[PDB]
Amino acid sequence: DFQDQVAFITGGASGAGFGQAKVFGQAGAKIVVADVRAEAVEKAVAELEGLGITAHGIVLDIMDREAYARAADEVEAVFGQAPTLLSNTAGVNSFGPIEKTTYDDFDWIIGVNLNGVINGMVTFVPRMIASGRPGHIVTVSSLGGFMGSALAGPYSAAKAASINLMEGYRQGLEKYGIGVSVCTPANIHGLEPEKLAEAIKKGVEDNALYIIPYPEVREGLEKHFQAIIDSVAPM
């Protein structure tokens, strides 16, 4: 079903990224695990190979644009083609009062959660297009991207951008047979990494723009959106 697909997953050495490596892997995909923790990568790929998944490990900080370019080249060297599935899953956060936020807080958190995914998009989109093969791109953002917050301020803002940015690329890339989705998990008991992974794979199959496997958030989301609509000036 995903046989002879190549999937490039950031933050794939853990959590939702690893879950995706596993779930896509079990469907037949060749996996590239891109993560910044060299030790965790090593482990993650051993464990994937243990499961009969063909998997390559790339230690990478997605905030480094030129290494991200080396990786992309590396992927073509190893598997003989650019990825046909890109997953921007790597994320980081830290909690505290939004007024107390510092430049380093911003650079780190905006860095991983927004600039990282831009780097992902700029690196791979032209290669995926030049391949002339169908493809797909998923970004795991966050429910916080739909609503700013006083304790996860920088994180929420970056996620709001990555959601909006995926909305854009969906429109741009449809003409290339490349679908685009954004997953917004509820991280504000809690959906397991493999359960979320299966939701994402389903969304990829369905070519869904939004992947929101949390029936419980609907009320809150409707409320937040109505508050905006109510703000529109009459008449």
In 37-115, where does DSSP find H-type helix?
38-49, 65-79, 103-110
For residue 173, state whether it binds a second copy (rule: CB under 8 A).
Answer: yes
Q: Can you say whether residue 80 is alpha, beta or left, with left for phi > 0 and alpha for psi between -120 and 50 degrees? A: left
Residue 162 near which of ligand NAI, a second copy, none (CB within 5-8 Å, type-dependent): a second copy
- Count other Cβ atoms within 10 Å, centred on residue 92: 14
Cis bond upstream, residue 166 (ω within 30): no
Cα gap 48→87, rounded to integer Å: 17
- The token pair at 202 is 């389903």
Q: Between 173 and 200, whose beta carbon lies closer to ligand NAI?
A: 200
Residue 108 binding a second copy, by CB under 8 A: no
Residue 58 interaction partner, one of a second copy, ligand NAI, none, beta carbon < 5-8 Å per kind: none
* Stretch touching a second copy by CB under 8 A, among 2-10, 12-20, 47-55, 95-103: 95-103
Tell me, by CB under 6 A, how many residues bind ligand NAI.
19
Nearer CB in complex with a second copy: 40/183: 183
Q: Which of 58, 86, 197, 199 binds a second copy (CB under 8 A)?
A: 199
SS3 199: helix
Q: Chain-centre distance of CA 177, in angstroms?
A: 19
Residue whose token pair is 């596993």: 22
State the burial class of residue 154 (Cβ atoms within 10 Å of its Cβ: 0-12, 13-18, 19+).
buried
Does position 165 interact with a second copy (CB under 8 A)? The reply is: yes
- Rounded to whole angstroms, the Cα distance separating 165 from 54 reads 31
Cα(114)–Cα(165) distance, integer angstroms? 9
Q: Which of 7, 16, 45, 67 binds ligand NAI (CB under 6 A)?
A: 16
176 tagged catalytic: no
Please tell me which residue in 68, 103, 155, 210 is annotated as part of the active site: 155
Q: Which residues are annotated as a binding site for NADH?
A: 14, 16, 35, 37, 61-62
Q: How many residues are recorded in the chain?
A: 235
Range 80-139, binding ligand NAI (CB under 6 A): 90-92, 112
Catalytic residues: 155
Which chain residues interact with a second copy by CB under 8 A?
65, 97-99, 101-103, 106, 110, 114, 118, 122, 125-126, 129, 145-150, 152-154, 156-173, 176, 199, 208-215, 217-218, 221-222, 225, 227-229, 231-235
Which chain residues interact with ligand NAI by CB under 6 A?
10-11, 13-17, 35-37, 40, 60-63, 90-92, 112
